[PDB]
PDB file of C-alpha atoms in Angstrom:
ATOM      1  CA  UNK A   1      93.819  85.258 110.731  1.00  0.00           C
ATOM      2  CA  UNK A   2      93.565  84.954 106.940  1.00  0.00           C
ATOM      3  CA  UNK A   3      91.722  86.918 104.266  1.00  0.00           C
ATOM      4  CA  UNK A   4      89.820  83.820 103.081  1.00  0.00           C
ATOM      5  CA  UNK A   5      87.757  83.620 106.292  1.00  0.00           C
ATOM      6  CA  UNK A   6      86.636  87.266 106.120  1.00  0.00           C
ATOM      7  CA  UNK A   7      85.997  86.765 102.389  1.00  0.00           C
ATOM      8  CA  UNK A   8      83.733  83.821 103.270  1.00  0.00           C
ATOM      9  CA  UNK A   9      81.949  85.970 105.878  1.00  0.00           C
ATOM     10  CA  UNK A  10      81.353  88.724 103.303  1.00  0.00           C
ATOM     11  CA  UNK A  11      80.276  86.047 100.797  1.00  0.00           C
ATOM     12  CA  UNK A  12      77.704  84.652 103.245  1.00  0.00           C
ATOM     13  CA  UNK A  13      76.453  88.144 104.153  1.00  0.00           C
ATOM     14  CA  UNK A  14      76.067  89.069 100.474  1.00  0.00           C
ATOM     15  CA  UNK A  15      74.170  85.825  99.807  1.00  0.00           C
ATOM     16  CA  UNK A  16      71.893  86.589 102.771  1.00  0.00           C
ATOM     17  CA  UNK A  17      71.315  90.152 101.537  1.00  0.00           C
ATOM     18  CA  UNK A  18      70.429  88.836  98.072  1.00  0.00           C
ATOM     19  CA  UNK A  19      68.109  86.164  99.512  1.00  0.00           C
ATOM     20  CA  UNK A  20      66.308  88.483 101.955  1.00  0.00           C
ATOM     21  CA  UNK A  21      65.583  91.422  99.634  1.00  0.00           C
ATOM     22  CA  UNK A  22      65.152  89.473  96.331  1.00  0.00           C
ATOM     23  CA  UNK A  23      66.779  92.098  94.112  1.00  0.00           C
ATOM     24  CA  UNK A  24      66.614  91.410  90.368  1.00  0.00           C
ATOM     25  CA  UNK A  25      67.921  94.807  89.186  1.00  0.00           C
ATOM     26  CA  UNK A  26      71.587  95.648  88.616  1.00  0.00           C
ATOM     27  CA  UNK A  27      71.278  99.421  89.157  1.00  0.00           C
ATOM     28  CA  UNK A  28      69.631  99.238  92.611  1.00  0.00           C
ATOM     29  CA  UNK A  29      72.468  97.182  94.154  1.00  0.00           C
ATOM     30  CA  UNK A  30      73.806 100.096  96.216  1.00  0.00           C
ATOM     31  CA  UNK A  31      72.601  99.932  99.820  1.00  0.00           C
ATOM     32  CA  UNK A  32      72.707  96.154 100.365  1.00  0.00           C
ATOM     33  CA  UNK A  33      76.233  95.711  98.983  1.00  0.00           C
ATOM     34  CA  UNK A  34      77.591  98.803 100.769  1.00  0.00           C
ATOM     35  CA  UNK A  35      76.090  97.727 104.107  1.00  0.00           C
ATOM     36  CA  UNK A  36      77.406  94.187 103.554  1.00  0.00           C
ATOM     37  CA  UNK A  37      80.887  95.605 102.948  1.00  0.00           C
ATOM     38  CA  UNK A  38      80.554  97.867 105.997  1.00  0.00           C
ATOM     39  CA  UNK A  39      79.394  94.978 108.211  1.00  0.00           C
ATOM     40  CA  UNK A  40      82.106  92.554 107.032  1.00  0.00           C
ATOM     41  CA  UNK A  41      85.100  94.299 108.651  1.00  0.00           C
ATOM     42  CA  UNK A  42      86.149  93.124 112.138  1.00  0.00           C
ATOM     43  CA  UNK A  43      85.795  95.363 115.174  1.00  0.00           C
ATOM     44  CA  UNK A  44      88.941  94.110 116.929  1.00  0.00           C
ATOM     45  CA  UNK A  45      92.332  95.759 116.516  1.00  0.00           C
ATOM     46  CA  UNK A  46      94.511  92.672 115.991  1.00  0.00           C
ATOM     47  CA  UNK A  47      92.113  91.185 113.424  1.00  0.00           C
ATOM     48  CA  UNK A  48      92.740  94.148 111.093  1.00  0.00           C
ATOM     49  CA  UNK A  49      96.479  93.410 111.163  1.00  0.00           C
ATOM     50  CA  UNK A  50      95.670  89.706 110.716  1.00  0.00           C
ATOM     51  CA  UNK A  51      93.666  90.443 107.553  1.00  0.00           C
ATOM     52  CA  UNK A  52      96.439  92.743 106.291  1.00  0.00           C
ATOM     53  CA  UNK A  53      99.074  90.075 107.036  1.00  0.00           C
ATOM     54  CA  UNK A  54      97.635  87.399 104.736  1.00  0.00           C
ATOM     55  CA  UNK A  55      97.666  87.473 100.940  1.00  0.00           C
ATOM     56  CA  UNK A  56      94.960  88.860  98.669  1.00  0.00           C
ATOM     57  CA  UNK A  57      95.557  92.556  99.431  1.00  0.00           C
ATOM     58  CA  UNK A  58      98.299  94.954  98.322  1.00  0.00           C
ATOM     59  CA  UNK A  59      99.568  98.510  98.850  1.00  0.00           C
ATOM     60  CA  UNK A  60      98.749  99.977  95.415  1.00  0.00           C
ATOM     61  CA  UNK A  61      95.636 102.166  95.476  1.00  0.00           C
ATOM     62  CA  UNK A  62      92.810 102.086  92.936  1.00  0.00           C
ATOM     63  CA  UNK A  63      91.091 105.349  93.944  1.00  0.00           C
ATOM     64  CA  UNK A  64      92.730 108.127  95.957  1.00  0.00           C
ATOM     65  CA  UNK A  65      89.394 109.710  96.917  1.00  0.00           C
ATOM     66  CA  UNK A  66      88.660 107.047  99.547  1.00  0.00           C
ATOM     67  CA  UNK A  67      91.652 108.046 101.703  1.00  0.00           C
ATOM     68  CA  UNK A  68      90.657 109.685 105.014  1.00  0.00           C
ATOM     69  CA  UNK A  69      92.585 112.518 106.653  1.00  0.00           C
ATOM     70  CA  UNK A  70      93.731 111.253 110.055  1.00  0.00           C
ATOM     71  CA  UNK A  71      96.891 110.428 111.991  1.00  0.00           C
ATOM     72  CA  UNK A  72      95.776 106.860 112.785  1.00  0.00           C
ATOM     73  CA  UNK A  73      97.308 103.995 110.817  1.00  0.00           C
ATOM     74  CA  UNK A  74      94.562 101.577 111.927  1.00  0.00           C
ATOM     75  CA  UNK A  75      91.844 103.655 110.236  1.00  0.00           C
ATOM     76  CA  UNK A  76      93.833 103.665 106.983  1.00  0.00           C
ATOM     77  CA  UNK A  77      94.230  99.879 107.224  1.00  0.00           C
ATOM     78  CA  UNK A  78      90.494  99.498 107.910  1.00  0.00           C
ATOM     79  CA  UNK A  79      89.758 101.671 104.862  1.00  0.00           C
ATOM     80  CA  UNK A  80      92.118  99.537 102.748  1.00  0.00           C
ATOM     81  CA  UNK A  81      90.390  96.325 103.888  1.00  0.00           C
ATOM     82  CA  UNK A  82      87.032  97.996 103.169  1.00  0.00           C
ATOM     83  CA  UNK A  83      88.256  98.955  99.681  1.00  0.00           C
ATOM     84  CA  UNK A  84      89.437  95.403  98.929  1.00  0.00           C
ATOM     85  CA  UNK A  85      86.129  93.993 100.208  1.00  0.00           C
ATOM     86  CA  UNK A  86      84.177  96.415  97.997  1.00  0.00           C
ATOM     87  CA  UNK A  87      86.311  95.332  95.013  1.00  0.00           C
ATOM     88  CA  UNK A  88      85.603  91.649  95.737  1.00  0.00           C
ATOM     89  CA  UNK A  89      81.871  92.143  96.384  1.00  0.00           C
ATOM     90  CA  UNK A  90      81.280  94.386  93.355  1.00  0.00           C
ATOM     91  CA  UNK A  91      83.156  91.886  91.178  1.00  0.00           C
ATOM     92  CA  UNK A  92      81.303  88.837  92.563  1.00  0.00           C
ATOM     93  CA  UNK A  93      77.806  90.364  92.846  1.00  0.00           C
ATOM     94  CA  UNK A  94      76.961  89.731  89.178  1.00  0.00           C
ATOM     95  CA  UNK A  95      77.954  86.061  89.442  1.00  0.00           C
ATOM     96  CA  UNK A  96      75.989  85.694  92.680  1.00  0.00           C
ATOM     97  CA  UNK A  97      72.906  87.270  91.075  1.00  0.00           C
ATOM     98  CA  UNK A  98      73.323  84.853  88.154  1.00  0.00           C
ATOM     99  CA  UNK A  99      73.499  81.942  90.615  1.00  0.00           C
ATOM    100  CA  UNK A 100      70.452  83.303  92.469  1.00  0.00           C
ATOM    101  CA  UNK A 101      68.457  83.540  89.233  1.00  0.00           C
ATOM    102  CA  UNK A 102      69.574  80.049  88.165  1.00  0.00           C
ATOM    103  CA  UNK A 103      68.920  78.551  91.619  1.00  0.00           C
ATOM    104  CA  UNK A 104      65.128  78.941  91.683  1.00  0.00           C
ATOM    105  CA  UNK A 105      62.698  78.155  88.875  1.00  0.00           C
TER     106      UNK A 105
ATOM    107  CA  UNK B   1     125.634  98.071 104.810  1.00  0.00           C
ATOM    108  CA  UNK B   2     122.476 100.208 104.934  1.00  0.00           C
ATOM    109  CA  UNK B   3     118.916  99.772 103.642  1.00  0.00           C
ATOM    110  CA  UNK B   4     119.239  97.977 100.316  1.00  0.00           C
ATOM    111  CA  UNK B   5     117.337  98.876  97.147  1.00  0.00           C
ATOM    112  CA  UNK B   6     116.822  97.029  93.843  1.00  0.00           C
ATOM    113  CA  UNK B   7     119.518  97.688  91.257  1.00  0.00           C
ATOM    114  CA  UNK B   8     117.184  99.309  88.696  1.00  0.00           C
ATOM    115  CA  UNK B   9     117.432 102.576  90.674  1.00  0.00           C
ATOM    116  CA  UNK B  10     121.209 102.811  90.235  1.00  0.00           C
ATOM    117  CA  UNK B  11     120.933 101.304  86.735  1.00  0.00           C
ATOM    118  CA  UNK B  12     118.439 103.997  85.673  1.00  0.00           C
ATOM    119  CA  UNK B  13     120.531 106.745  87.310  1.00  0.00           C
ATOM    120  CA  UNK B  14     122.739 106.949  84.180  1.00  0.00           C
ATOM    121  CA  UNK B  15     119.808 108.389  82.138  1.00  0.00           C
ATOM    122  CA  UNK B  16     118.777 104.852  81.208  1.00  0.00           C
ATOM    123  CA  UNK B  17     115.262 104.667  79.778  1.00  0.00           C
ATOM    124  CA  UNK B  18     112.770 101.904  80.649  1.00  0.00           C
ATOM    125  CA  UNK B  19     112.617 101.116  76.925  1.00  0.00           C
ATOM    126  CA  UNK B  20     116.367 100.493  77.122  1.00  0.00           C
ATOM    127  CA  UNK B  21     115.751  98.466  80.311  1.00  0.00           C
ATOM    128  CA  UNK B  22     113.325  96.122  78.595  1.00  0.00           C
ATOM    129  CA  UNK B  23     115.324  96.013  75.336  1.00  0.00           C
ATOM    130  CA  UNK B  24     119.053  95.842  76.152  1.00  0.00           C
ATOM    131  CA  UNK B  25     118.945  93.719  79.326  1.00  0.00           C
ATOM    132  CA  UNK B  26     117.243  90.703  77.693  1.00  0.00           C
ATOM    133  CA  UNK B  27     117.111  88.999  74.287  1.00  0.00           C
ATOM    134  CA  UNK B  28     113.557  89.446  73.033  1.00  0.00           C
ATOM    135  CA  UNK B  29     111.111  87.926  70.548  1.00  0.00           C
ATOM    136  CA  UNK B  30     108.763  89.692  68.144  1.00  0.00           C
ATOM    137  CA  UNK B  31     105.185  89.275  66.912  1.00  0.00           C
ATOM    138  CA  UNK B  32     103.002  90.827  64.212  1.00  0.00           C
ATOM    139  CA  UNK B  33      99.599  92.420  64.856  1.00  0.00           C
ATOM    140  CA  UNK B  34      96.863  94.447  63.058  1.00  0.00           C
ATOM    141  CA  UNK B  35      96.600  91.962  60.154  1.00  0.00           C
ATOM    142  CA  UNK B  36      95.078  88.900  61.950  1.00  0.00           C
ATOM    143  CA  UNK B  37      98.037  86.798  60.793  1.00  0.00           C
ATOM    144  CA  UNK B  38      99.216  85.610  64.259  1.00  0.00           C
ATOM    145  CA  UNK B  39     102.789  84.803  63.277  1.00  0.00           C
ATOM    146  CA  UNK B  40     106.302  85.320  64.620  1.00  0.00           C
ATOM    147  CA  UNK B  41     109.878  85.282  63.309  1.00  0.00           C
ATOM    148  CA  UNK B  42     112.187  82.278  62.960  1.00  0.00           C
ATOM    149  CA  UNK B  43     113.102  80.250  66.044  1.00  0.00           C
ATOM    150  CA  UNK B  44     116.459  81.014  67.731  1.00  0.00           C
ATOM    151  CA  UNK B  45     116.744  77.364  68.994  1.00  0.00           C
ATOM    152  CA  UNK B  46     116.998  78.775  72.518  1.00  0.00           C
ATOM    153  CA  UNK B  47     114.823  76.100  74.147  1.00  0.00           C
ATOM    154  CA  UNK B  48     116.693  73.179  75.717  1.00  0.00           C
ATOM    155  CA  UNK B  49     114.636  71.679  78.544  1.00  0.00           C
ATOM    156  CA  UNK B  50     111.465  73.747  78.909  1.00  0.00           C
TER     157      UNK B  50
ATOM    158  CA  UNK C   1     106.905  85.162 108.800  1.00  0.00           C
ATOM    159  CA  UNK C   2     106.695  85.637 112.573  1.00  0.00           C
ATOM    160  CA  UNK C   3     108.255  88.100 114.998  1.00  0.00           C
ATOM    161  CA  UNK C   4     110.674  85.524 116.424  1.00  0.00           C
ATOM    162  CA  UNK C   5     112.249  84.511 113.098  1.00  0.00           C
ATOM    163  CA  UNK C   6     112.659  88.137 111.965  1.00  0.00           C
ATOM    164  CA  UNK C   7     114.235  89.027 115.322  1.00  0.00           C
ATOM    165  CA  UNK C   8     116.552  85.990 115.122  1.00  0.00           C
ATOM    166  CA  UNK C   9     117.648  87.100 111.645  1.00  0.00           C
ATOM    167  CA  UNK C  10     118.069  90.645 113.014  1.00  0.00           C
ATOM    168  CA  UNK C  11     120.530  89.752 115.754  1.00  0.00           C
ATOM    169  CA  UNK C  12     122.118  87.184 113.417  1.00  0.00           C
ATOM    170  CA  UNK C  13     122.970  90.011 111.007  1.00  0.00           C
ATOM    171  CA  UNK C  14     124.016  92.069 114.050  1.00  0.00           C
ATOM    172  CA  UNK C  15     126.436  89.410 115.314  1.00  0.00           C
ATOM    173  CA  UNK C  16     127.763  88.924 111.769  1.00  0.00           C
ATOM    174  CA  UNK C  17     128.446  92.676 111.646  1.00  0.00           C
ATOM    175  CA  UNK C  18     130.155  92.422 115.053  1.00  0.00           C
ATOM    176  CA  UNK C  19     132.325  89.511 113.853  1.00  0.00           C
ATOM    177  CA  UNK C  20     133.150  91.529 110.722  1.00  0.00           C
ATOM    178  CA  UNK C  21     133.901  94.806 112.547  1.00  0.00           C
ATOM    179  CA  UNK C  22     135.346  93.563 115.908  1.00  0.00           C
ATOM    180  CA  UNK C  23     133.430  96.051 118.036  1.00  0.00           C
ATOM    181  CA  UNK C  24     134.239  96.220 121.760  1.00  0.00           C
ATOM    182  CA  UNK C  25     132.761  99.493 123.042  1.00  0.00           C
ATOM    183  CA  UNK C  26     129.090  99.973 123.901  1.00  0.00           C
ATOM    184  CA  UNK C  27     129.033 103.387 122.201  1.00  0.00           C
ATOM    185  CA  UNK C  28     130.313 101.650 119.061  1.00  0.00           C
ATOM    186  CA  UNK C  29     127.852  98.803 119.715  1.00  0.00           C
ATOM    187  CA  UNK C  30     124.890 101.205 119.504  1.00  0.00           C
ATOM    188  CA  UNK C  31     125.783 102.395 115.992  1.00  0.00           C
ATOM    189  CA  UNK C  32     126.095  98.750 114.923  1.00  0.00           C
ATOM    190  CA  UNK C  33     122.635  98.111 116.406  1.00  0.00           C
ATOM    191  CA  UNK C  34     121.226 101.035 114.394  1.00  0.00           C
ATOM    192  CA  UNK C  35     122.936  99.797 111.213  1.00  0.00           C
ATOM    193  CA  UNK C  36     121.714  96.232 111.802  1.00  0.00           C
ATOM    194  CA  UNK C  37     118.145  97.430 112.320  1.00  0.00           C
ATOM    195  CA  UNK C  38     118.711  99.402 109.119  1.00  0.00           C
ATOM    196  CA  UNK C  39     119.742  96.053 107.615  1.00  0.00           C
ATOM    197  CA  UNK C  40     117.761  92.774 107.572  1.00  0.00           C
ATOM    198  CA  UNK C  41     114.487  94.386 106.454  1.00  0.00           C
ATOM    199  CA  UNK C  42     111.884  92.369 104.508  1.00  0.00           C
ATOM    200  CA  UNK C  43     110.780  93.447 101.041  1.00  0.00           C
ATOM    201  CA  UNK C  44     107.666  91.261 101.027  1.00  0.00           C
ATOM    202  CA  UNK C  45     104.720  93.418 102.073  1.00  0.00           C
ATOM    203  CA  UNK C  46     102.923  90.404 103.567  1.00  0.00           C
ATOM    204  CA  UNK C  47     105.872  89.802 105.903  1.00  0.00           C
ATOM    205  CA  UNK C  48     105.840  93.484 106.922  1.00  0.00           C
ATOM    206  CA  UNK C  49     102.155  93.282 107.829  1.00  0.00           C
ATOM    207  CA  UNK C  50     102.839  89.915 109.503  1.00  0.00           C
ATOM    208  CA  UNK C  51     105.342  91.580 111.845  1.00  0.00           C
ATOM    209  CA  UNK C  52     102.592  94.085 112.694  1.00  0.00           C
ATOM    210  CA  UNK C  53     100.132  91.201 113.233  1.00  0.00           C
ATOM    211  CA  UNK C  54     102.366  88.982 115.391  1.00  0.00           C
ATOM    212  CA  UNK C  55     102.872  89.259 119.146  1.00  0.00           C
ATOM    213  CA  UNK C  56     105.399  91.412 120.968  1.00  0.00           C
ATOM    214  CA  UNK C  57     104.310  94.732 119.442  1.00  0.00           C
ATOM    215  CA  UNK C  58     101.893  97.520 120.382  1.00  0.00           C
ATOM    216  CA  UNK C  59     100.059 100.216 118.448  1.00  0.00           C
ATOM    217  CA  UNK C  60     101.068 103.140 120.670  1.00  0.00           C
ATOM    218  CA  UNK C  61     104.756 104.043 120.866  1.00  0.00           C
ATOM    219  CA  UNK C  62     106.889 106.065 123.258  1.00  0.00           C
ATOM    220  CA  UNK C  63     108.595 108.524 120.890  1.00  0.00           C
ATOM    221  CA  UNK C  64     106.659 110.562 118.325  1.00  0.00           C
ATOM    222  CA  UNK C  65     109.613 112.455 116.839  1.00  0.00           C
ATOM    223  CA  UNK C  66     110.679 109.445 114.767  1.00  0.00           C
ATOM    224  CA  UNK C  67     107.140 109.138 113.369  1.00  0.00           C
ATOM    225  CA  UNK C  68     107.150 110.698 109.870  1.00  0.00           C
ATOM    226  CA  UNK C  69     104.436 112.942 108.435  1.00  0.00           C
ATOM    227  CA  UNK C  70     103.593 111.735 104.925  1.00  0.00           C
ATOM    228  CA  UNK C  71     100.855 109.984 102.971  1.00  0.00           C
ATOM    229  CA  UNK C  72     102.984 106.835 102.604  1.00  0.00           C
ATOM    230  CA  UNK C  73     101.786 104.159 105.025  1.00  0.00           C
ATOM    231  CA  UNK C  74     104.718 101.787 104.449  1.00  0.00           C
ATOM    232  CA  UNK C  75     107.227 104.497 105.442  1.00  0.00           C
ATOM    233  CA  UNK C  76     105.437 105.081 108.768  1.00  0.00           C
ATOM    234  CA  UNK C  77     105.240 101.325 109.388  1.00  0.00           C
ATOM    235  CA  UNK C  78     108.919 100.906 108.469  1.00  0.00           C
ATOM    236  CA  UNK C  79     109.875 103.691 110.894  1.00  0.00           C
ATOM    237  CA  UNK C  80     107.810 102.087 113.679  1.00  0.00           C
ATOM    238  CA  UNK C  81     109.319  98.636 113.038  1.00  0.00           C
ATOM    239  CA  UNK C  82     112.780 100.264 112.854  1.00  0.00           C
ATOM    240  CA  UNK C  83     112.308 101.915 116.264  1.00  0.00           C
ATOM    241  CA  UNK C  84     111.015  98.648 117.761  1.00  0.00           C
ATOM    242  CA  UNK C  85     113.966  96.728 116.292  1.00  0.00           C
ATOM    243  CA  UNK C  86     116.479  99.275 117.636  1.00  0.00           C
ATOM    244  CA  UNK C  87     114.969  98.999 121.137  1.00  0.00           C
ATOM    245  CA  UNK C  88     114.774  95.190 121.041  1.00  0.00           C
ATOM    246  CA  UNK C  89     118.254  94.695 119.561  1.00  0.00           C
ATOM    247  CA  UNK C  90     119.674  97.035 122.216  1.00  0.00           C
ATOM    248  CA  UNK C  91     117.898  95.078 124.980  1.00  0.00           C
ATOM    249  CA  UNK C  92     119.103  91.727 123.601  1.00  0.00           C
ATOM    250  CA  UNK C  93     122.556  92.918 122.484  1.00  0.00           C
ATOM    251  CA  UNK C  94     123.621  94.396 125.836  1.00  0.00           C
ATOM    252  CA  UNK C  95     124.240  90.765 126.843  1.00  0.00           C
ATOM    253  CA  UNK C  96     125.597  89.815 123.398  1.00  0.00           C
ATOM    254  CA  UNK C  97     128.381  92.411 123.723  1.00  0.00           C
ATOM    255  CA  UNK C  98     129.637  90.496 126.772  1.00  0.00           C
ATOM    256  CA  UNK C  99     129.005  87.112 125.121  1.00  0.00           C
ATOM    257  CA  UNK C 100     131.113  87.974 122.057  1.00  0.00           C
ATOM    258  CA  UNK C 101     133.990  89.191 124.232  1.00  0.00           C
ATOM    259  CA  UNK C 102     133.763  85.984 126.281  1.00  0.00           C
ATOM    260  CA  UNK C 103     133.737  83.708 123.211  1.00  0.00           C
ATOM    261  CA  UNK C 104     137.115  84.785 121.810  1.00  0.00           C
TER     262      UNK C 104
END
C-alpha cells in the first residue's frame, strides 16, 4: 500500500540480479536492471493506485519520450511507476555494486 | 465559490514578473561570489527567536 | 486521506453553502451540488491519488462526454473525481434537502 514496500522488492530483486550474474562492469548494466524494473511493478489494478497514493512519486516528468499513446489512465500510471523505479534503481545501482565489491574479499 | 487557485496567478496577471515576485514580496539578503570570499552584508537584527 | 473524510468534507461544504444560500428547491439544490463538488478539492497530489486508491470508486465510468482529451493526467483524474462527487453528493443530498428543511 506504500512505495517503500515495492522499493524494498525492487531492492531485493536488484541485489539478486547482481549476485546471480556477478557483473563488475558499469556499461553492461542494461538488461538486468531493466528486467528488474520491469518485474518490480505489480500486476493488480488497485496496487498501482496504492503505489501512486503514497509519497516518493510526483507528477512532474523527467523525459517526455517514455509517454505511451493510449486512452487508458492505468497504463500511464504504470509507466510513471516504472519511470520512478528506473530512477531509483539507476541511482542506487552504483552504491549496490560498491557494496557487492566490498562484501566479498 | 468555484475551484480555487493560488494567488500568484492573479498577482502575475498585472504584468508582474517573477523577478518582481521574488524581490518585492519579501525582504531579502545578499551574498558575494566569484572571489572565494564567502561574505555577506551587515546584519539587519531580524532574528528574535530562531 | 481516505474517501470517507473527503466525502464528509464535501457534504460539509455543501451544507454550509445551503445554510449560506437558503436553498429550498431541488433544481436549485443541483446547482449547489455542482458548485460544492467544484469546491472542497484537495491540492495535495498524494491525497488525489489516495482518493483513487481508496474504496468506493471504479475505473470504468458511465459517461464519456465529461472525460477530457488532453495529455494532462491530473485534469482527467479531476474530472472523474468531480463526476463521482456530483453523483455521490446528489445521492446523499436528496435526503439532506429534506433534513435541512426539517431542522429549521
